[model samples]
Target: SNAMSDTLRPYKNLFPGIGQRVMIDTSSVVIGDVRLADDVGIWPLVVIRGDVNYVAIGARTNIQDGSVLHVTHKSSSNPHGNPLIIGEDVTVGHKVMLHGCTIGNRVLVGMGSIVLDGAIIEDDVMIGAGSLVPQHKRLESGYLYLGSPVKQIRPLSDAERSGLQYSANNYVKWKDDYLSQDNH
Candidate 1:
């Protein structure tokens, strides 16, 4: 069963910075997307579709399992309106849905969050798990957001701030480990 979906491993080399053992399920698809920088990890069951255009991913970013990222047929008001642009050193938690948005560098999106169209996630920000980020909403840098419509709860500590980078780094290796199982 694993052999049938082994293509994801080959694609993992597309971004050497991405780690091992990051499992992507058969239900997912990553279509010719470009990684602008190094160190990006995408876990299992994550679908990133570049069907409409190219999806540009930043370096050192981890897209956790079951996350969905795709381009929309609808238009946005932004000048550089693309499918999505994820900045470097970002951690997108498990099962997060991101469509038509620009995520700044060093951003951490918690698990099961829905980031809607034109939602700008600034650098060094954390959106708590299961939050709904409205369309065209812009979050401030260095803050933590929670609850529906995503309100900023408080400022993040230096220790807590490192969570995003830690997740990204670990994810990259996880992908590699999963891919290397056959060799071992």
Candidate 2:
């Protein structure tokens, strides 16, 4: 049935792109108008539902286990309601909730974070675990953000900024290995 497939699916006749070398776990669910770029990896039990809205995840990005990615539908109150857009080399950690947010390139969203509607996480930003980014918040580039309400902690060192890409690269390698073993 359409409700139970593990690959990309259609919503309102708009289908998602599965992309080359993308590894999505069988336990995960991705549907609707989502576009996943090449070398993307999705771990177990993740849900990316782009039913009423769209989602776009860039290359070398990884959505870890238990993460949920969704969007807000357009309505009379908000004509252009938010969609979920993640840029290249992003690391979405386990149990994260990303709703109608725009994440820039090489960003690291730590475990258990919640990014709300209209939030923009800029390039090379590192969001700490258990943080909550409120609606319409703009996280500046090259910084580390943390806390329940997600305050700016400090500017990231050069190595820390580069580590974001390193983390995404490692996930791609791991996914390759997982695919090679036929374990996925």
Candidate 3:
């Protein structure tokens, strides 16, 4: 869904223009009360909304197409204390949804994944496609998490780690380049 869909473009008309440095495509919506850092590229149809709580996305992260970063404020005593934190250089894949969690730097959340409330994903971790990260769980750094509740496979290779950095950096650069070229 990273590619623009004409069917979804009309939905973006309801939202105000996003910051020039952040690319919210015509098919996407960066919803209210969400703070995005410099050069964040939110692709087509991605929804970063924190209507009930605060959704904090960090620098140079790419929330890919059709992904939704949100929060659920119903965690017992902290009911109504939900917050979503995505650290720098996170690469959230298409159609994924993160709710009430903290994703660390250089993390790769694969396509169609669901990171449930209170989940903590560490740096350099790779979540396989369609996996569901359970609530209150923490993933180790440099590992791969797969399956429904998520399990560690192995640490990432040096080459794999380098590639993720390269990808995130590329997206950040593209955002900068786009803003510099377009006055608006």
Q: Evaluate all candidate structures by whole-model CA lDDT and list the values in order.
A: 0.74, 0.93, 0.79
For model 3, the superposed segments whose C-alpha errors exceed 4 Å read 1-20, 74-76, 176-181
Give the lDDT ranking, best first. 2, 3, 1
User: How many clashes (backbone N, Cα, C below 3 Å) per candidate?
Assistant: 21, 0, 1
**Two-way lDDT contest, 1 vs 3, winner:** 3
TM-score of 1: 0.77
Worst 10 residues of 2 by lDDT: 1-10
Q: Sort by TM-score, best first: what order? A: 2, 3, 1
lDDT of 2 by residue, 29-66 (tens): 88899899999999999999999899999999999999
Top lDDT prediction, candidate number:
2
Candidate 3 matches the true fold with a TM-score of 0.83
lDDT, model 3, position 20:
36
User: Each model's TM-score?
Assistant: 0.77, 0.94, 0.83
Residue 74, candidate 2: alpha-carbon lDDT: 95
lDDT per residue (tens digit) for residues 1-184 in model 3:
3764342222232322334377657667655467777778888877776666777778889988889877876567886676898999889998998999999999989999999888899888899999999999999998888999788888888998887798799888876776676666
